[PDB]
């Protein structure tokens, strides 16, 4: 999309106020999307830890690499979402539902940064998919996503927002490889 403008920027970068989140629809998340934890595991973010860890004299390679190994882990490897059903796949089984929105939750997380969790609801008694999921993806107000991190539970909202520490994080299916480091090599 259009490069952000400064206020969206910071917003991206967890700075804004709750008066300005908005509402968003499923729609903004329509597309095929492949989860990064392959990539990960086949040793192609190297390069990005390798950046991290040299520009962070604070942290490791490992503290890097472990922090987003638990961050990217799922057996979800891909997610499909178009006409307001949710599909997940886990190996060679498909689950879906149709998903009802029940609004926005702005988390502030230690540092003093700020995200919003954008949340949805299976209500269809025959379906096997994950009762709440909730979707973050550094946006506050309507847009389409470039990636997003998805939080998953069959119990209540609330377990989801006390997830802080694992965040699968998918990317249009349609980017190669190189593309998707890419991306992530300027994040
Ligand atoms: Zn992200």
Same mark, same amino acid.
């Given at each position: 999309?259009?490069?952000?403008? !400064?206020?969206?920027?910071?917003? #991206? ?5 709750? @008066? ?34 040299? @520009? ?5 390679? #490992? ?9 990217? #882990? ?18 060679? !089984? ?83 490889? !190189? *593309?998707?480091? *890419? !991306?992530?090599?300027?994040?």
């Amino acid at each position: 999309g259009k490069p952000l403008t !400064e206020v969206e920027q910071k917003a #991206a970068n967890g700075v804004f106020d709750d @008066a300005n989140v908005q509402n968003r629809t499923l729609s903004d998340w329509d597309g095929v999307w492949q989860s990064v934890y392959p990539l990960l595991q086949s040793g192609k973010l190297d390069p990005v830890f390798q950046k991290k860890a040299d @520009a962070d004299k604070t942290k490791t390679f #490992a503290e890097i690499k472990d922090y987003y190994h638990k961050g990217y #882990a799922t057996d979800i490897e891909m997610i499909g979402i178009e006409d307001g059903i949710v599909e997940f796949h886990r190996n060679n !089984e498909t689950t879906s539902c149709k998903y009802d929105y029940d609004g926005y939750k702005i988390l502030t997380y230690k540092s003093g940064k700020k995200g919003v969790r954008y949340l949805f609801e299976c209500k269809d008694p025959e379906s096997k998919a994950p009762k709440y999921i909730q979707f973050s993806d550094h946006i506050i107000a309507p847009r389409k996503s470039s990636h997003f991190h998805i939080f998953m539970g069959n119990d209540s909202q609330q377990s989801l927002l006390n997830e802080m520490e694992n965040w699968p994080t998918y990317y249009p299916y349609q980017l190669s490889s !190189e *593309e998707v480091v *890419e !991306e992530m090599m300027s994040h």
